[PDB]
Every structure is written in structure tokens, then in C-alpha cells.
Write a protein that binds this ligand. Structure first.
Ligand SMILES: Cc1c2[nH]c(c1CCC(=O)O)Cc1[nH]c(c(CCC(=O)O)c1C)Cc1[nH]c(c(CCC(=O)O)c1C)Cc1[nH]c(c(C)c1CCC(=O)O)C2
Ligand SMILES: Cc1c2[nH]c(c1CCC(=O)O)Cc1[nH]c(c(CCC(=O)O)c1C)Cc1[nH]c(c(CCC(=O)O)c1C)Cc1[nH]c(c(C)c1CCC(=O)O)C2
Lengths: 356, 356
């Protein structure tokens, strides 16, 4: 691959000092961009995900508008449950659905052996290689997947939920079958994430987007062990294959209660939602992980001047060390690309002023 | 399409006698026109190129001011390297840039298969069809592209250069990789140029704008073969598709040294810069190609009366046969539209006096 030119994001992820704070945005390839909507109108969602050229194009679009310090491959976390043998749709304007969710223990029999999942996800690896080549070393490329618990919630609920009552009912009433499913997911995720790195990914983020539905006791029993396993096994396999391990980011949205445990879970970077005060997060995680985040995505509805001031305040709280800027979740479809631009420029501007 | 009403430019290109000398100007759709600047202020440069209506409008603007004998579609030669997978910007007042130029052989791996480029340039074909329809047969519409060597220089240098030292270093140190790249470009250009004709173009010009950096030995080894290939293959494909081949113009700026070879390269018309005395050019190319050019664009800074006299002298040197008037390069942004008008009127006036 082409030599990396701007490695600020990677240096920051490993905790090294940098000249400015690197920034990227979750869902930077997203519907808030008119050009994203146009490229997407061509195919259906999961068909877009299966076209390396389409994925590459969507990945590059934000970088043409903004000097973001990382790209993230266009894909979706739900490709893993799909590759395990579940059928999944993107309903017109009503999000992901599994018309036949997992509801009893016997339903696990329908899933593929987790060891064959990576072979089913070749299309993602093709997209990663192509995007890495086309990026031509501009900035690092992040690969990603959903965390076991979060993927379990989609598989059991059949979509989004305000309570995760069915998935949590599994945890309390079917603890053994839950662990079995969480292990299947872990065993699928590890080779998939390794394959993403083999294909060209230079960092990995694991999205535990539905952490907040668990309190600490269930999180520690059912989510944390598998989060830890994913990091340990991915690093081991990469070492063994003669490759360099990449920085790994754990993002547990609404996971305020788990920050101390997440800082010990074998990830270089702990991603934060907007509800956690940066200084409180720093006390929780300690001095040797990098934090990522955490501006309220809705702050981007404010004026460009206001966004600059909110960014300044955020960066004052995080300080110059061991920090990668981002929002506290993904960009929303109704947001203004110019305000995303203002966010990026302000992180760059204020982080330089904070140093010198 | 509407039937062509004024075909003088085409008759002259094929070498037929005409009642007056037809004239057009390189960069006639350009910044010297206040109305060009206004229409352009709407979008960024490459976004203008992707709007058929914007391209059509820019193409027609000069024709509303001046009785030019041809239109040339508004586009840019750099759409080809873009469609091959390189990222390219139009920097505010500092021209084209590729932030990640090709610098080693392995960088060729990032490019698209040349056979898929035409599909990426549909927007240009749409602009051509629309402009041909809106022109309503007034005058012929010229399509165009950059020549392989010249496109290679942009791809390797990452922009303009006073020496082409990096691209020439490729020719001397990486001859094989250079030929590989020049072949990729040729194989992309042929289907693109054919598609321009399919879409409505009635003539084609290939811009070898950076010929002059090569002497004769390198030009014959690395530029000429691909110039020849482009013409041979475009004509073959058009024949085979049941379409009429169009006149093709090769313009090698600062290519004094290559005129004899260019006259044998399969182009109806050889375009000249202002440094070549017309009578010397005529001896070089012989009696069976048409010459195009060649007034110093800077001559348009002279008074309207002076421009008339310079034009008279130019036309005396070229003579009435096998000649299409133009400047020796494109119009510059600070030139006066009224002086462009004087140029057009003088060619028409003096060429009629030269015949009768
Ligand atoms: C709406 C939706 C989709 N997929 C999903 C949803 C949410 C469903 C729910 O919560 O009930 C499922 C999903 N996809 C992704 C996540 C993790 C993000 C999180 O919730 O923390 C989740 C939970 C990451 C992603 N989803 C996507 C990426 C690729 C990276 C990028 O787009 O920049 C990632 C990491 C791409 C994607 N995927 C989808 C769209 C429309 C897009 C474009 C971005 C947008 O406009 O929202 C469909
Ligand atoms: C400044 C620039 C542009 N594009 C380019 C440059 C020069 C870069 C360099 O030499 O370092 C690259 C380019 N574009 C074109 C050429 C070939 C002309 C030549 O050098 O012989 C080249 C070398 C043709 C063109 N470039 C364009 C056309 C369309 C036809 C027309 O505009 O009449 C062609 C054939 C349009 C264009 N393209 C651009 C502008 C501003 C315009 C409007 C015309 C003007 O004011 O200069 C941007």
C-alpha cells in the first residue's frame, strides 16, 4: 500500500504527543451529505455494502469536503449477523429489520459455524483494500464491527428497541444460551476483524452501541468478557500472522458505568458519548488510554460560531494529551455539511492554540 | 440532432476550399468573460463540469458575443485522471492539484481498469448531447481530451511544472512503468473520445500541452506512439459502430520539433503555437493536412486596429487553403472580450479579401 502521509490519528491513538488534535466523525459517510444520498439511490443498502467501488466512493466523499484525520470504511455492523445466516432488510425509512429474529434456544441451530463468516464477508475486505489504495496514504483507514452484546440485541429484538426487553430477558432467563450466542459472535468477529486488517485497515473500532441498556452487573457478566476476548484474540492472531497489531477503539454508548473496566479491556482508545463530562471520564479511565469524543452531535445544529466555542470548551476539558476528537455518536441525516466543516476546523484551530 | 447550418469549420478541417477562413479560440469559454465568472461562482470547478446545464451555458456564452465558427464543450482534460481514480482539486487561484501524485511504479495499482473510465464520464457525454441539441445546428461542436504524455505529467507532477523533472525522470529511470501508464491512459482515452462522438461531438482535439518539455528523441519514444494509437483506434471504433469518423486535431504546444511526425500521425488537423512561423510549419507538415492557429494570445492586448493588422499578416502567411484560424494557446483571464471580437471579425474580413 501507499505510504501513510498524515498519521496524526494513529500517533494520538497510541498516546503519543502530536502537534494538533486529530478529528473524525462517526457516520461521516452519511445521509447528511447530498452526494451520499445520490450514490445510494443507485442500489439497495446491503447491495451498496457489497460493491467495493460504491463503498470506496462513500468513504472518500467526506474527505473531499473536510480535512478529517481518518477515513472509516463504508459498511454496516449488521453484515455479521447476515453472514451468520440471518436474513436482514433496510426497511424504507424505518431502519434495519430481521423478519425472523432469534427467540428460543433452538434458533441458534440455524447459524453458520462462526469460523466460516470471514469467507462470507470477502466483499468487505475487497472494499477495504480498494479504499486503502485509492486513499493513497492521505490518512489512516478505520475498519469496524459491532460488539457481541450489541449484535445479539439486533438478532433477538429483530431491530431497534427502546428497552431491549427481549434481549435482556434472554440474559436473565436463558443465561447459558446467551453465553453460547455471545461466544458465536465473538468467534465470528475475531477472524472478520483480523481479515479487515489483512485487507488494509489501519485501526479498528468495536461499536457497543447498546451498552446503556445494561447496568454494571449485566454488562460485566455478558458484555465485558467478550469485549475483552475480541481485543486479546485479534492482537494474537495478527502477531502470529507476522502483521503489526493496529490500535483498537471500544465505544460503549451510554456506558458511563463501565469506563473503569473498559480502560482495562485491552483497547488503546475508549470512545465516549456526550453525557460523560470529559474530566470525569479521564478520572475513570486513568492516564494510559486515549479518549475519543465527545461532542453532542446535536451541537452541530448551533451556529458555526457557537460550534467553535463548544469545541473550545470540550478541548479545554480533555486537554492536549491522549485525545482524539469526535462527536459523542454519529451525525444525523438532517445536519448541515457546513457545520460539520466548522466542527473539524475548530478542533484543528483550537487544539493548536492549546499547545503553543 | 438538428441539421448543421454553418459547416465551414468541418469543410476546412477535411481540407476543402471554403469562402472564408473559419475561426475559433481555445478557452473561448473562459474567465475573460464576466458572464463565465458569474455562472462559475455558483459551484466549485469539477462540480460545474458535472452539470450538463452549466457546461452547455458556458459553451454557448462566447457564441452569443462572437460569430465563432465552432463551439467547444466546457469540460477539462483532468476529468480523465479523476475517472482513473485519482483525487484532483482546483486550488483557489493556484490551479489544478493532485495531493497524492503517482511517484512509484506500485502507485499504478490504484488506478481503475481503463475500460471502465467512459462509464465514469457519463456526465461529459450528457453535457455534449445537451449542448449539441441547444446549439440547434448553428456551428459544429468540438469534443476534446488531453494526450497521454500530458496527462501523465499531471498525474506524476501533481500539477503544473516549469521543467516536468519528475515526469521526465520516470521516462529515463522507469521506461517500462512509463509505457504501462501511457498505455492505461491511451486505453481510457479511446473509449472516452468515441463516447464523445456518440454523444454528439462533430470534431475532436487532443491537447498535448506539455510536448515542449520533451525533445524529439523522448517525444518520439513516449508521446508520439500513443498520439498515433489514439487516432487509429478512435477511427476504427467509430467505423465499426456504424458512425462517421470526425476530423481530429492534434495540438502539441511547443512541439516545433515534432511537426513532420505529427503530420503523419493520423490527424486531419495539426494545431500550432505562436512560436512557429506559419510558412515554416507548412513546409514541415506538407500539403495534405490542415493547420490550425496560431496568433500569440498576448497579441489581443494590442489595440483593435493592431490586432487586425497582425491577423492580416498571419492569414497572408498561412494562405487561403487548409487553414483554420485560432490563437496559439488559450485566452488569458485578463483579456478584453472586445479584442476577442476584433480577432474573430478580422479573420472573417481578411480571409474573404484574400480570396476575391
Ligand atoms: C439506520 C441504521 C443503519 N444501520 C444501523 C442503523 C441503526 C439502527 C438502530 O439503531 O435501530 C445499525 C448500525 N450501524 C452502525 C451502528 C453503530 C453506530 C452506533 O449506533 O453506535 C449501528 C447500531 C455503524 C455504521 N453505519 C454505517 C457505518 C459506516 C461508516 C460511515 O458511514 O461513516 C457505520 C460504522 C453506514 C450506514 N448504515 C446505515 C446508514 C443509513 C448508513 C449511512 C450513515 C447514516 O446516514 O446514518 C443503516
Ligand atoms: C487553469 C487550468 C484549469 N484546467 C487546467 C488548467 C491549467 C493547469 C496548468 O497548466 O498548470 C488543465 C488544462 N485544461 C485544458 C488544458 C489544455 C489547454 C492547454 O494547456 O493547451 C489544460 C492543460 C483545456 C481546457 N480547459 C477548459 C476547457 C473547455 C473549453 C473552453 O473552456 O473553452 C479546455 C479545453 C476549461 C477550464 N479549465 C480551467 C478553467 C479556469 C477553465 C475555463 C477557461 C479559462 O479561463 O482558463 C481550470
Amino acid at each position: 500500500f501507499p505510504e501513510l502521509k498524515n498519521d496524526t490519528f494513529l500517533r494520538a491513538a497510541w498516546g503519543e504527543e502530536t502537534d494538533y488534535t486529530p478529528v473524525w466523525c462517526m457516520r461521516q459517510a452519511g445521509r447528511y451529505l447530498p452526494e451520499f444520498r445520490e450514490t445510494r439511490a443507485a442500489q439497495d443498502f446491503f447491495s451498496t455494502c457489497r460493491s467495493p467501488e460504491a463503498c470506496c466512493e462513500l468513504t472518500l466523499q467526506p474527505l473531499r469536503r473536510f480535512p478529517l484525520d481518518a477515513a472509516i470504511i463504508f459498511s454496516d455492523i449488521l453484515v455479521v449477523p447476515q453472514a451468520l445466516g440471518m436474513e436482514v432488510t433496510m426497511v424504507p425509512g424505518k431502519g434495519p429489520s430481521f423478519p425472523e429474529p432469534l427467540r428460543e434456544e433452538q434458533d441458534l441451530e440455524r447459524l453458520r459455524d462462526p469460523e466460516v463468516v470471514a469467507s462470507e464477508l470477502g466483499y468487505v475486505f475487497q472494499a477495504i483494500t480498494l479504499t486503502r489504495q485509492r486513499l493513497a496514504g492521505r490518512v489512516p483507514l478505520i475498519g469496524f464491527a459491532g460488539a457481541p452484546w450489541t449484535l445479539m440485541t439486533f438478532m433477538v429484538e429483530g431491530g431497534g428497541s427502546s428497552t431491549m426487553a427481549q434481549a435482556k430477558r434472554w440474559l436473565y432467563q436463558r443465561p447459558q444460551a446467551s453465553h453460547q450466542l455471545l461466544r458465536i459472535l465473538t468467534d465470528a468477529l475475531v477472524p472478520y476483524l483480523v481479515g479487515q486488517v489483512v485487507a488494509g485497515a489501519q485501526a479498528l473500532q468495536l461499536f457497543e452501541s447498546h451498552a446503556g441498556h445494561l447496568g454494571p452487573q449485566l454488562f460485566n457478566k455478558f458484555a465485558l468478557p467478550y469485549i475483552r476476548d475480541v481485543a486479546k484474540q485479534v492482537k494474537a492472531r495478527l502477531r502470529e500472522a507476522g502483521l503489526a497489531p493496529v490500535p483498537m477503539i471500544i465505544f460503549a454508548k451510554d456506558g458511563h458505568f463501565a469506563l473503569e473496566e473498559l480502560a482495562q479491556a485491552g483497547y488503546e482508545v475508549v470512545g465516549l458519548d456526550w453525557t460523560v463530562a470529559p474530566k470525569k471520564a479521564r478520572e475513570c479511565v486513568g492516564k494510559t488510554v486515549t479518549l475519543q469524543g465527545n461532542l453532542d452531535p446535536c451541537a452541530l445544529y448551533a451556529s458555526e460560531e457557537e460550534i467553535g466555542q463548544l469545541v473550545k470548551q470540550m478541548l479545554d476539558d480533555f486537554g492536549p494529551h491522549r485525545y482524539i476528537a469526535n462527536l459523542g455518536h454519529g451525525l444525523y441525516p438532517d445536519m448541515d455539511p457546513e457545520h460539520v466543516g466548522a466542527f473539524v476546523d475548530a478542533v484543528h484551530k483550537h487544539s493548536r492554540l492549546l499547545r503553543q
